[PDB]
């Protein structure tokens, strides 16, 4: 019956699911639980460099708020 | 030692009998029954025997029909171009030993005068099921191979 | 769709649990449940199901040992004895 | 963690390709009133493994090659390029977020014809070179409409970033405003990947005595994996381009499931199409491109330049 | 850097899968055509004008839309005229 | 009486012209073909599970040869050579002499199964139902020599398959 | 440039092997030189060493897709020389299985034509139908293909009880299967691009080149031997002859599909008009007696003995007998010298003259069209080479 085709489809589906899931999880792991910053243009890059300086630990994804005022 | 060689033989034998890609020489009426083995009732693809296989990608040659003298050199050439391991299944009386045309001036009296044969499938033609029995018999022949066992004891 | 899933579960129970269900799946690539028509003296078991279409309505589950040969994985059509050969190939209706 | 990320892209691709072969054979089987692989493993789940092992222990064909350098380059180029096209794909996050990711994919795919050309050049057979030249001429012809169609669609997106196509389709799939381009895009990917009814390389080599494989079983399997990796990639790209999936930043896995389903269905439609039609004649698929798709794509490229301006629906630049 | 590392991995793996696939299995012992040139040349000339069309998604942001739309349409029309010229001169024939 | 398979005038009214333009541009008849293959995807396949399931055959089936006996165990063959005379392939070879008890019996009875065309003329010709084509079709071999049957092999085939052979003859002999 | 086509496709194909030597200029084919004899097995010489009965199985193996039709052609030729007549029930059975054989041939012709052009799927659907028709062959003769069922004097055995009901159940559903095939091909623009205006042959040329069957009717010639020179009981059934208008591959494809429908129409009448009676001529000097008679009556035993050793003698004479076989006019020029073995048996295979016209029909076409033209001729090299 046709549903006997599904196990191969499901295996194929899992293999295509892993790359997208892995990338998302690895980004959160590397970026303090947040999305990886997108810096396509000099403005965005300048702010990312500034955030590195402000963090105090050399990580752009470490954010500082009012507590530093 | 012997245990590791024994299991490697099982693995490679399993892979080869599970992926038998045939080159069919559809020479005469026996080829019709070969087509019926590919047809839905028997579906040789479901055993891993692919439908369309190029001669240079083939593991088994099926000689399905009468072999004439005019054709014999071309059949040998295709066999010689087959990469190894390679097996030959002779299907039907004509290919097996000349059959109805055994006494003809223009017919090779069995394809085993031109190529080594692994399985002889009898009938004129063998039914599609009889051919499938022969292919399954070739699979069990491959299962009994002990290539690495022999090599280890050289 | 739930009734199809139930019939799927019925096949596991109809093959004596998971172990028997897996055994027939790997030996015969089929997990259908049929009526037992009989068993020959070599251990082959013959089943029928007349709701299946012609061709699939009779089958044999080969014995695991015949004439001193381990046939758990290696089975072939020549293992069917002549008295059952006629019934299995639908040359006759009576087993 | 990045090297780990690359492996979690490469290795799953090769496994998907391996099991696409099983899916193709079973889907083609059931459309043909049969089953396809169901003995080697349950439901044929071990068939790709058996095929892989078998092909790599097969006796290698002796390469009567006229150019050793280009003989080994071609499979490396094909497989390396195939894996390279996946690194900007947003699923929903790309491995490499490229500002000009669309141009990267356009530029990298344009190099894929070098493996076709180098392999036929190295074959040391006049028949193989003619077939390679025929395959290249078909590939570059359909690259023309793929590029123009892609540009036309980007006039609704405003950017060359692939992730911006997700934002563009936040309310509606782009297939609605651009279904005429979607149909020609879909057929063009079939012709680009030499897929039936455009499988002229397989079709023509069957007829011509002397147009053979010329690669050993192992190296020829590397060509096959590259081709099927491209088939899945082209259908992932088609899903991103025309069937945009909504992205929830806090639940990225939800996007991946839905976008994976669309990619699988589009990939299966390639199999569906292969089961349904006869093959084009070579001159007939060239006429389909130069005398049909190209005139329509040019007129639609003009339309899609004008439409955002005349509706005041010009997308943002960033 | 990340991009170069990804590129190195992809082709290094491809090189490795090809080298062993070309070497390890060896351990197991046992009429120039003018029509085809002209399709290539036609592809090249169309490819060049595709290059001139690629910046269009950025050109539509200009405050000078009148000029931008005219030049965009002018370029695509000259492509249509190029195809029309080849067509009417039997440059797209195969017989 | 004859009919035309392809002699039709397409209508040139605007509605019909636009039906054909819609088919050309929207690929309607190609979509229709996709519908047909999709419907087959959801049909039960025709494949049977060989060797656990077998293709149906009839009592008349012409398979592997066998030499038969009377209920007492005596051979039916009396070396008349009608089968050898009629055989279209000259596949049968017979020699005979008086048996020690005076019976007319063969000392050689060979069938070259690679000459045989499995036509059943021998069993038609036989006057005493001695040579038959049995129901077996699964006797492929690994060597050519195994298919050159002598009398002992054919008698062993008869003793092996008589249970099925006798029932099949009972089923079909009133048609002969 | 010079080019040689491959012996056969890379999927199972049952037409035989052909060496096609071609001359090309660019895409266009300028010359086609088929090199045959790769399946020449000297059948015509072997027949001279056989009795008339012993030679009958050779005709199963000529056009081995149309077995019983070839048997009918040979049987009619011998019956004519013998001056005897097969009984009416045998004639109806011969027409019934002649049309079942036409269905078998046309499925193979149409679907392998499509398969070689790249349309693989219909081959699988319609070969399940072929498998069921093989069962009808096997139930009357014990063989799926080479039945050796139709013989001079009638048929070998009567239909088993219950067979006609099963033929009815099959026929009831077959037109739907044809419709599914037409859904895939008839209106398909790719199929039409591969066949329309390909291999055009004029009515005048078709006649002079020796064509027959659909190769004539595709060009508008109104000719069918079942209508014009009827044999057996074809004069007692109603059916239409499909006629083409363009003389190209597409029209010939339509003719073959419509002929399948007419074959079902004929089978329907055969199932309803089947008469009772004996199935072989009641002349024991030609047709062997029943086994019960052979085992009881002295005369029957003698005639059984002589028919299976010497065979019947045929009066001296020569005949050219032809039928409308599925591939075209299939005939035998049979010479009898008065003995029980034919002196000469020339076989007229319709595909022989059709293939000889491949060079004419392929002029001004491309290489891929050569495959389509070979398919539209429906060539089996058992009958071409003999
Ligand atoms: C890379 C990992 C490779 C995984 C090996 C998978 C082997 C699976 C397998 O052999 O199936 C059981 C097979 C299946 O048995 P089979 O192939 O002989 O027959 C099964 C029954 N029929 C054919 C009727 C359906 O078991 C074996 O025969 C033993 C071979 C083991 C090979 C593995 C070597 C370790
Ligand atoms: C990806 C690409 C790499 C994939 C692996 C492919 C290469 C595997 C190694 C093959 C060469 C092994 C050399 C063995 C030498 C030897 O013992 O002599 C041979 C001996 C030769 O026998 P012989 O020594 O008795 O001589 C034969 C007689 N004469 C010489 C007269 C002809 O046996 C064999 O031929 C069979 C060897 C099979 C090797 C099996 C290796 C282990 C299992 C491989 C599994 C592959 C998994 C693939 C996974 C999927 C793809 C990634
Ligand atoms: C308000 C104003 C707005 C302005 C814009 C208005 C637009 C109006 C026009 C809309 C219609 C445009 C449609 C564009 C699609 C392309 C049409 C086309 O090219 O079809 C013609 C082509 C050739 O067909 P042919 O019969 O040979 O024509 C004779 C040529 N001498 O035929 C073909 O291409 C057939 C291709 C054969 C291969 C097809 C195999 C697969 C088919 C099934 C796939 C279905 C599509 C799935 C799409 C998925 C998308 C993700
Ligand atoms: C004509 C025949 C076709 C031949 C060409 C082949 C075409 C194959 C098409 C395959 C893809 C079809 C769509 C797949 C359905 C899967 C839908 C899904 O899983 O998610 C639900 C989705 C709606 O949600 P979503 O897509 O995220 O829309 C948000 C807008 N950005 O979708 C809601 O339904
Ligand atoms: C809704 C508002 C509008 C409502 C009213 C509708 C207005 C628009 C429709 C009217 C436009 C005029 C129609 C023009 C099309 C007719 C041209 C033609 O007939 O050419 C066909 C023919 C080519 O056919 P072929 O068989 O391949 O070769 C010749 C063999 N006899 O002859 C040829 O040789 C063709 C050679 C020239 C082909 C021109 C190709 C131009 C390139 C495409 C550009 C498309 C537009 C810009 C993009
Ligand atoms: C795909 C799944 C199969 C669907 C079932 C097939 C079907 O019912 O379509 C048949 C329908 C009738 O078309 P037809 O018989 O050829 O007559 C000319 C047009 N009435 O033809 C149709 O209505 C098909 C319409 C296709 C619409 C164009 C699809 C474009 C895809 C991009 C959006
Ligand atoms: S063995 Fe019989 S069926 Fe096979 S090719 Fe010879 S004659 Fe034809
Ligand atoms: S079946 Fe026919 S060919 Fe075979 S032995 Fe009997 S008479 Fe001879
Ligand atoms: S098998 Fe029958 S026909 Fe042949 S020699 Fe014996 S008795 Fe006579």
From Swiss-Prot, chain B:
Q: Could you confirm whether the keyword Transmembrane appears in this record? A: no
* EC supergroup of this enzyme: translocase
Molecular function terms in GO for this entry? Answer: 4 iron, 4 sulfur cluster binding; metal ion binding; NADH dehydrogenase (ubiquinone) activity; quinone binding
Q: Give the reactions, separated by semicolons, that this protein catalyses.
A: a ubiquinone + NADH + 5 H(+)(in) = a ubiquinol + NAD(+) + 4 H(+)(out)
An annotated GO cellular component of this protein is: respiratory chain complex I
What keywords is this UniProt entry annotated with?
A: 4Fe-4S, Electron transport, Hydroxylation, Iron, Iron-sulfur, Membrane, Metal-binding, Mitochondrion, Mitochondrion inner membrane, NAD, Oxidoreductase, Respiratory chain, Transit peptide, Translocase, Transport, Ubiquinone
Question: Where is the PTM Hydroxyarginine found along the chain?
Answer: 52
**Endoplasmic reticulum is among the record's keywords:** no
Q: Which GO terms describe its biological process?
A: aerobic respiration; electron transport coupled proton transport; mitochondrial electron transport, NADH to ubiquinone; mitochondrial respiratory chain complex I assembly
The protein's location, in the record's own words, is: Mitochondrion inner membrane
The prosthetic group or cofactor this protein requires is: [4Fe-4S] cluster
- Cofactor info, note text: Binds 1 [4Fe-4S] cluster.
Give the free-text PTM comment from the record. Answer: Hydroxylated ar Arg-52 by NDUFAF5 early in the pathway of assembly of complex I, before the formation of the juncture between peripheral and membrane arms.
> What membrane topology was assigned to this protein in its record?
Peripheral membrane protein
UniProt main location, coarse: mitochondrion
Q: At the top level of its lineage, which domain of life is listed?
A: Eukaryota
**What does the subunit section of this Swiss-Prot or TrEMBL entry state?**
Core subunit of respiratory chain NADH dehydrogenase (Complex I) which is composed of 45 different subunits. This is a component of the iron-sulfur (IP) fragment of the enzyme.
What family does the Swiss-Prot or TrEMBL record give for this protein?
A: Belongs to the complex I 20 kDa subunit family.
User: What is the name attached to this protein's record?
Assistant: NADH dehydrogenase [ubiquinone] iron-sulfur protein 7, mitochondrial
The coding gene here is: NDUFS7
UniProtKB/Swiss-Prot annotation, chain C:
- Is Mitochondrion tagged as a keyword? yes
- The protein's superkingdom reads Eukaryota
Subcellular location(s) of the protein: Mitochondrion inner membrane
Q: How does it sit in the membrane?
A: Peripheral membrane protein
GO CC annotations? mitochondrial inner membrane; mitochondrion; respiratory chain complex I
Write out the entry's keywords from A to Z. Answer: Acetylation, Electron transport, Membrane, Mitochondrion, Mitochondrion inner membrane, Respiratory chain, Transport
Q: What broad class describes the main subcellular location of this protein? A: mitochondrion
Its family remark reads: Belongs to the complex I NDUFA12 subunit family.
Role: Accessory subunit of the mitochondrial membrane respiratory chain NADH dehydrogenase (Complex I), that is believed not to be involved in catalysis. Complex I functions in the transfer of electrons from NADH to the respiratory chain. The immediate electron acceptor for the enzyme is believed to be ubiquinone.
Q: How does this polypeptide assemble, per the annotation?
A: Complex I is composed of 45 different subunits.
User: What is the recorded name of this protein?
Assistant: NADH dehydrogenase [ubiquinone] 1 alpha subcomplex subunit 12
**Organism name:** Bos taurus
Q: Which gene encodes it?
A: NDUFA12
UniProtKB/Swiss-Prot annotation, chain D:
What are the UniProt keywords, alphabetically?
A: Electron transport, Formylation, Membrane, Mitochondrion, Mitochondrion inner membrane, NAD, Respiratory chain, Translocase, Transmembrane, Transmembrane helix, Transport, Ubiquinone
Molecular function GO labels: NADH dehydrogenase (ubiquinone) activity
Q: EC?
A: 7.1.1.2
Pfam families recorded: NADHdh
List the transmembrane segments.
Answer: 2-22, 70-90, 100-120, 146-166, 172-192, 222-242, 253-273, 294-314
Any one GO CC term of this protein is: respiratory chain complex I
Which top-level group of life is the source organism from?
Answer: Eukaryota
Give the chief site where it resides. Answer: mitochondrion
The answer, when asked if Protein transport is one of the entry's keywords, is no
Q: Name one GO biological process term.
A: aerobic respiration
Q: Does the keyword Heme apply?
A: no
Protein's membrane topology: Multi-pass membrane protein
Q: Where in the cell is it found?
A: Mitochondrion inner membrane
What positions are modified (N-formylmethionine)?
Answer: 1
Q: Which InterPro entries match?
A: NADH_UbQ_OxRdtase_su1/FPO, NADH_UbQ_OxRdtase_su1_CS
UniProt catalytic activity: a ubiquinone + NADH + 5 H(+)(in) = a ubiquinol + NAD(+) + 4 H(+)(out)
- Coiled-coil stretches: none
Q: What function does the entry list?
A: Core subunit of the mitochondrial membrane respiratory chain NADH dehydrogenase (Complex I) which catalyzes electron transfer from NADH through the respiratory chain, using ubiquinone as an electron acceptor. Essential for the catalytic activity of complex I. Essential for the assembly of complex I.
Its family remark reads: Belongs to the complex I subunit 1 family.
* Quaternary structure annotation from Swiss-Prot or TrEMBL: Core subunit of respiratory chain NADH dehydrogenase (Complex I) which is composed of 45 different subunits.
- The protein's name: NADH-ubiquinone oxidoreductase chain 1
Its source organism is Bos taurus
This protein's gene is called MT-ND1
UniProtKB/Swiss-Prot annotation, chain F:
Q: Does the keyword 4Fe-4S apply?
A: yes
Q: Which cofactor does it need?
A: [4Fe-4S] cluster
The EC number(s) given in the record are 7.1.1.2
Classify the protein's membrane topology as the record does: Peripheral membrane protein
Q: What GO CC terms are in its UniProt record?
A: mitochondrial inner membrane; respiratory chain complex I
Highest taxon of source = Eukaryota
Q: Which residues bind [4Fe-4S] cluster 2?
A: 87, 116, 119, 122
Task: List locations, semicolon-separated.
Answer: Mitochondrion inner membrane
Q: Where is the 4Fe-4S ferredoxin-type domain?
A: 68-97, 107-136
UniProtKB keywords: 4Fe-4S, Electron transport, Iron, Iron-sulfur, Membrane, Metal-binding, Mitochondrion, Mitochondrion inner membrane, NAD, Oxidoreductase, Repeat, Respiratory chain, Transit peptide, Translocase, Transport, Ubiquinone
Residues engaged in binding [4Fe-4S] cluster 1 = 77, 80, 83, 126
Query: Which Gene Ontology biological process is one annotated for this entry?
Result: mitochondrial respiratory chain complex I assembly
In alphabetical order, the GO MF annotations are: 4 iron, 4 sulfur cluster binding; metal ion binding; NADH dehydrogenase (ubiquinone) activity
Reaction(s) catalysed by this chain's protein: a ubiquinone + NADH + 5 H(+)(in) = a ubiquinol + NAD(+) + 4 H(+)(out)
Q: Which family does it belong to?
A: Belongs to the complex I 23 kDa subunit family.
Quaternary structure (record): Core subunit of respiratory chain NADH dehydrogenase (Complex I) which is composed of 45 different subunits. This is a component of the iron-sulfur (IP) fragment of the enzyme. Interacts with RAB5IF.
The molecule here is called: NADH dehydrogenase [ubiquinone] iron-sulfur protein 8, mitochondrial
Q: Which residues of the full protein are shown?
A: 37 to 212 of 212
């Amino acid at each position: 019956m046709w549903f006997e085709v599904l196990p191969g489809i499901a295996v194929m589906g899992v293999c295509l699911f892993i790359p997208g899931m892995a990338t998302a999880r690895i980004h959160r792991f590397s970026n303090g639980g947040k999305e990886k910053r997108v810096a396509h243009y000099p403005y965005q890059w300048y702010l990312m460099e500034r955030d590195r300086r402000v963090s105090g630990v050399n990580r752009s994804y470490v954010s500082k708020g009012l507590e530093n005022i | 030692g012997e245990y590791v060689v024994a299991k490697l033989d099982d693995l490679i034998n399993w892979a080869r009998r599970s992926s038998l890609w045939p080159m069919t020489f559809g020479l005469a009426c026996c080829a019709v029954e070969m087509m019926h083995m590919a047809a839905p009732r028997y579906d040789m693809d479901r055993f891993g025997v692919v439908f369309r296989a190029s001669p240079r990608q083939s593991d088994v040659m099926i000689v399905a029909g009468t072999l004439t003298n005019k054709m014999a050199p071309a059949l040998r050439k295709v066999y010689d171009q087959m990469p190894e391991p390679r097996y030959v299944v002779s299907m039907g009386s004509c290919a097996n030993g000349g059959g109805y045309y055994h006494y003809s001036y223009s017919v090779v009296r069995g394809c085993d005068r031109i190529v080594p044969v692994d399985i002889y499938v009898p009938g004129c033609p063998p039914t599609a099921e009889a051919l499938l029995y022969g292919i399954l018999q070739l699979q069990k022949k491959i299962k009994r191979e002990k290539r690495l066992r022999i090599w280890y004891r050289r | 769709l739930l009734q199809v899933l139930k019939r799927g579960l019925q096949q596991v129970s109809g093959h004596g649990g998971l172990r028997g269900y897996l055994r027939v799946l790997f030996r015969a690539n089929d997990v259908r449940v049929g009526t037992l028509v009989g068993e020959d003296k070599y251990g082959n078991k013959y089943y029928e199901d007349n709701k299946q279409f012609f061709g699939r309505h009779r089958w044999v589950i080969y014995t695991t040992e015949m004439n001193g040969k381990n046939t758990f994985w290696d089975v072939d059509g020549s293992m069917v004895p002549p008295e059952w050969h006629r019934w299995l190939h639908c040359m006759t209706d009576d087993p | 963690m990045f090297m780990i990320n690359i492996l979690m892209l490469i290795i799953p691709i090769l496994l998907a390709v391996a099991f696409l072969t099983l899916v193709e054979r079973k889907v083609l089987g059931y459309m043909q009133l049969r089953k396809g692989p169901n003995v080697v493993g349950p439901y044929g789940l071990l068939q790709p493994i058996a095929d892989a092992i078998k092909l790599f222990i097969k006796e290698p064909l002796r390469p009567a090659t006229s150019s050793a350098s280009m003989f080994i380059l071609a499979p490396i180029m094909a497989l390396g390029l195939a894996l390279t096209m996946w690194i900007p794909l947003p699923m929903p996050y790309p491995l490499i977020n490229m500002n000009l990711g669309v141009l990267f994919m356009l530029a990298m795919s344009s190099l894929a014809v070098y493996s076709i050309l180098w392999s036929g050049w190295a074959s040391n057979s006049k028949y193989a070179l003619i077939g390679a030249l025929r395959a290249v001429a078909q590939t570059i012809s359909y690259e023309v409409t793929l590029a123009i169609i892609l540009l036309s669609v980007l006039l609704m997106s405003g950017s060359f970033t692939l992730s911006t196509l997700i934002t563009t389709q936040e309310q509606m799939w782009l297939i609605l405003p651009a279904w005429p381009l979607a149909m020609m895009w879909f057929i063009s990917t079939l012709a680009e990947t030499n897929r039936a009814p455009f499988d002229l390389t397989e079709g023509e080599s069957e007829l011509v005595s002397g147009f053979n494989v010329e690669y050993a079983a192992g190296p020829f399997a590397l060509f096959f994996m590259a081709e099927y990796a491209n088939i899945i990639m082209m259908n992932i790209f088609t899903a991103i381009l025309f069937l945009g999936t909504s992205h929830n930043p806090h639940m990225p896995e939800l996007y991946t499931i839905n976008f994976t389903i669309k990619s699988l269905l589009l990939t299966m439609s390639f199999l569906w199409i292969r089961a349904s039609y006869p093959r084009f004649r070579y001159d007939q698929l060239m006429h389909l491109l130069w005398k049909n798709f190209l005139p329509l794509t040019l007129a639609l490229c003009m339309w899609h330049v004008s439409l955002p301006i005349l509706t005041s629906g010009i997308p943002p630049q960033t | 850097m990340n991009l170069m590392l990804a590129l190195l991995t992809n082709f290094t793996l491809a090189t490795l899968l090809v080298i062993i696939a070309f070497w390890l299995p060896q351990l197991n012992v046992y009429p120039f055509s003018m029509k085809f040139f002209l399709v290539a040349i036609t592809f090249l000339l169309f490819d060049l004008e595709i290059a001139l069309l690629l910046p269009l998604p950025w050109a539509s942001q200009t405050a000078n839309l009148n000029t931008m739309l005219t030049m965009a349409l002018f370029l695509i029309i000259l492509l249509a005229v190029s195809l029309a010229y080849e067509w009417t001169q039997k440059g797209l024939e195969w017989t | 009486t004859y009919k035309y398979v392809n002699l039709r005038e397409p209508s040139m009214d605007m509605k019909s012209v636009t039906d054909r333009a819609a088919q050309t541009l929207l690929w309607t008849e190609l979509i229709r073909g996709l519908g047909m293959t999709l419907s087959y995807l959801f049909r039960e396949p025709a494949t049977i599970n060989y060797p656990f399931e077998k293709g149906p055959l009839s009592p008349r089936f012409r398979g592997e040869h066998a030499l038969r006996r009377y209920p007492s165990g005596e051979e039916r063959c009396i070396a008349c050579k009608l089968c050898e005379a009629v055989c279209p392939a000259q596949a049968i070879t017979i020699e005979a002499e008086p048996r020690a008890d005076g019976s007319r019996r063969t000392t050689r009875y060979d069938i070259d199964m690679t000459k045989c065309i499995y036509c059943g003329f021998c069993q038609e010709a036989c006057p005493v139902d001695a040579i038959v084509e049995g129901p077996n079709f699964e006797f492929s071999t690994e060597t050519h020599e195994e298919l050159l049957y002598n009398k002992e092999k054919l008698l062993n085939n008869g003793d092996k398959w008589e249970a099925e052979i006798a029932a099949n003859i009972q089923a079909d002999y009133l048609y002969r | 440039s010079n080019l040689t086509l491959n012996f056969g496709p890379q999927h199972p194909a049952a037409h035989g092997v052909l060496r096609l030597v071609m001359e090309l200029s660019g895409e266009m084919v300028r010359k086609c030189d088929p090199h045959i004899g790769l399946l020449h097995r000297g059948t015509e010489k072997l027949i001279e060493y056989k009795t008339y009965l012993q030679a009958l199985p050779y005709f199963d193996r000529l056009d081995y897709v149309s077995m019983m039709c070839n048997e009918q052609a040979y049987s009619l030729a011998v019956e004519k020389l013998l001056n005897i007549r097969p009984p009416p029930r045998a004639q109806w059975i011969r027409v019934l299985f002649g049309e079942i054989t036409r269905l078998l041939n046309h499925i193979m012709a149409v679907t392998t034509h499509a398969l070689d052009i790249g349309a693989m799927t219909p081959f699988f659907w319609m070969f399940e139908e072929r498998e069921k028709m093989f069962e009808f062959y096997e139930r009357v003769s014990g063989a799926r293909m080479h039945a050796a069922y139709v013989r001079p004097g009638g048929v070998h055995q009567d239909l088993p009880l219950g067979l006609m009901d099963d033929i009815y159940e099959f026929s009831k559903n077959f037109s739907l299967r044809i419709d599914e095939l037409e859904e895939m091909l008839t209106n398909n623009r790719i199929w039409r691009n591969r066949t329309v205006d390909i291999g055009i042959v004029t009515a005048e040329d078709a006649l002079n080149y020796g064509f027959s069957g659909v190769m004539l009717r595709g060009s508008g010639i109104q000719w069918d031997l079942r209508k014009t020179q009827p044999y057996d009981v074809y004069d007692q059934v109603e059916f239409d002859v499909p006629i083409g208008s363009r003389g190209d591959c597409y029209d010939r494809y339509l003719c073959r599909v419509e002929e399948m429908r007419q074959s079902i129409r004929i089978i329907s009448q055969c199932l309803n008009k089947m008469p009772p009676g004996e199935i072989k001529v009641d002349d024991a000097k030609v047709s062997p007696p029943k086994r019960a008679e052979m085992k009881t009556s002295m005369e029957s035993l003698i005639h059984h003995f002589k028919l299976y050793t010497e065979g019947y003698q045929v009066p001296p004479g020569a005949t050219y007998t032809a039928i409308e076989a599925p591939k075209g006019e299939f005939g035998v020029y049979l010479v009898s010298d008065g003995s029980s073995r034919p002196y000469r048996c020339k076989i007229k295979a319709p595909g022989f003259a059709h293939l000889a016209g491949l060079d004419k029909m392929s002029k001004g076409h491309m290489l891929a069209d050569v495959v389509a033209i070979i398919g539209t001729q429906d060539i089996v090299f058992g009958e071409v080479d003999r």
